[PDB]
Design a protein around this ligand. Structure first.
Ligand SMILES: *[C@H](O)[C@H](C[C@@H]1CCNC1=O)NC(=O)[C@H](CC1CCCCC1)NC(=O)[C@@H](NC(=O)OC(C)C)[C@@H](C)OC(C)(C)C
Ligand SMILES: *[C@H](O)[C@H](C[C@@H]1CCNC1=O)NC(=O)[C@H](CC1CCCCC1)NC(=O)[C@@H](NC(=O)OC(C)C)[C@@H](C)OC(C)(C)C
Lengths: 306, 306
């Protein structure tokens, strides 16, 4: 038993990370087959950053301007191309450690593991969610650009995130692996702000089920509630609406515990109305929203990868 | 910026995990060079578990009783030997993925990353601490025995923990990689209990410094306190004594923030006396004790491995 913020094992991604250096800028690249993916602002500098124009900037670069290093072995760039906000550097060597992989653009509320990297060397691994405002509450220092977010599904790495920037509020923004930003952010140095965030209600519900699977029952009640009446209370506390699709997704968790989803909603309602009154749930004194229903099933039941 | 429970990248350990099967029992082994390490109760069964006697049990086994599988390639056991509570199975093949490594027995309060495994396949990675009562608050299901805990120091994997058992309270107990249990636990099925736990005070202090490094300052005060007077308040709230050695270890964190350690102690004192009053620190509504002073420096400054 027990419940932990669990990231996926990171070995299949460690084997893909490289350092990319152009001009005065060093960041992280993702080496898959014979292509290295990285954020396109690597072709910027300190005065290119104001209001860039990357097409003009990229036509001025030669292949030998990109220094790409995999270990103490640095690769030869034989071509480049821009796709939205990512560079794709063609190198003369295929990565022999290329896992089976996909590129996926995830929905808000979905979770993924982040392998934080500096100078092409992995630093640490942790679990994050795409917030409803399309930021992520990461842990990123200078030079972490190019670190990726990913899920693992049997032996396939689904890459879902590349890191670009930190916002004044301390949260983080980036792109899918095809260069499209999550959210309304753009890769300029102009005032941008996150936009109001909300709590991922389906995830809270999923974590209460995790609590019940692990032996916490103190917050349950006899009451129930309708979906409209739950949503009327969730709105007041800045929670997202729960859709019938969310209810369905929470089916297995309901069926395994014997607590109807609408009954767990009545529990959350009273939890939001009265606070936790100095108790904890799964070691937390706040209602936790960065576990998906899939996360709970995986950890409380024990799915692996090979 | 930002602050996260960060585990070490797990690739160098994923490459060592194997499945070990003997009789009706399947658990996880650690393959380093030509030896596979695993918990010795793999030679038990459902009636061997009552009050075992592993010397007698082990002299009755032949090498071909141990089925050891690394991928869809299973190894040949050519010898075995017991060392405290771990089996060391000699195999005819050296693991080509053996990292540079050490075996270290850690102190309470120290943290490490756990690679949870089933049937030799890594499942997920997370960060834990050795509690003052020598248990760990892990996340472990049946078949997770043999999963290891580790730190990484440049390119050297310091293995510090092998998983053996869960206790009635839901916490977890195991050994160092030489088979010595942490704590007073033994590998029998007899009533054992954890013993009262305490909060790791130096770690709390270290995490408040993490908070200040990241922009939280609301909990600081002008007051200060002596070490005796801090320890008199910590005792009342079930915190461990803070030694001068702890103060020294918190030197760099003090020097980087301009907050004397004894001043941060006065902050914690008021935090313990008045609660947090509905505020959070680094996203937590409880004082967090599973970050060491080294953990904070690593994450807030950005040390890697290669
Ligand atoms: C790349 O490694 C780096 C990662 C950040 C540094 C600190 N934490 C990070 O996550 N990204 C940047 O430094 C980035 C540079 C590019 C320049 C051209 C395209 C935009 C990003 N700059 C930032 O993240 C800055 N944020 C920013 O300008 O956001 C505006 C307001 C929308 C950071 C470094 O500045 C602070 C002051 C921290 C907000
Ligand atoms: C090995 O994979 C497994 C891991 C635990 C199963 C569930 N969670 C775990 O971490 N370890 C065991 O199942 C272990 C078997 C051996 C048998 C001989 C030596 C002792 C351990 N048994 C337990 O962990 C049980 N705990 C236990 O007997 O502790 C006593 C009270 C000291 C667990 C499975 O039983 C419960 C009811 C969960 C406490």
């Amino acid at each position: 038993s027990g419940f932990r913020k669990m990231a996926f094992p990171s070995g299949k991604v460690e084997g893909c990370m490289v350092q990319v250096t152009c001009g005065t800028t060093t960041l992280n690249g993702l080496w898959l087959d014979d292509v290295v993916y990285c954020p396109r602002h690597v072709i910027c500098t300190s005065e290119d950053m104001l209001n860039p124009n990357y097409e003009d900037l990229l036509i001025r670069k030669s292949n030998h301007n990109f220094l790409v290093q995999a270990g103490n072995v640095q690769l030869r760039v034989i071509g480049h191309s821009m796709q939205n906000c990512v560079l794709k550097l063609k190198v003369d060597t295929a990565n022999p450690k290329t896992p089976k992989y996909k590129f996926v653009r995830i929905q808000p509320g979905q979770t993924f593991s982040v392998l934080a990297c500096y100078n092409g060397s992995p630093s640490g691994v942790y679990q994050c969610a795409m917030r409803p405002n399309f930021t992520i509450k990461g842990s990123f220092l200078n030079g972490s650009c190019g670190s990726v977010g990913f899920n693992i599904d049997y032996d396939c790495v689904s890459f879902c995130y590349m890191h670009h920037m930190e916002l004044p509020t301390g949260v983080h923004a980036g792109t899918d692996l095809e260069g499209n930003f999550y959210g309304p952010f753009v890769d300029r140095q102009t005032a941008q702000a996150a936009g109001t965030d909300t709590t991922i209600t389906v995830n809270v519900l999923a974590w209460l089920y995790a609590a019940v699977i692990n032996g916490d029952r103190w917050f349950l009640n006899r009451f129930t509630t309708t979906l409209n009446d739950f949503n009327l209370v969730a709105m007041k506390y800045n929670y997202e609406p729960l859709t019938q699709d969310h209810v369905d997704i929470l089916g297995p968790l309901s069926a395994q515990t014997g607590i109807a989803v609408l009954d767990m909603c009545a529990s959350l309602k009273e939890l939001l109305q009265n606070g936790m009154n100095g108790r904890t749930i799964l070691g937390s004194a706040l209602l936790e929203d960065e576990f998906t229903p899939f996360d709970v099933v995986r950890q409380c039941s024990g799915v692996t990868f090979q």
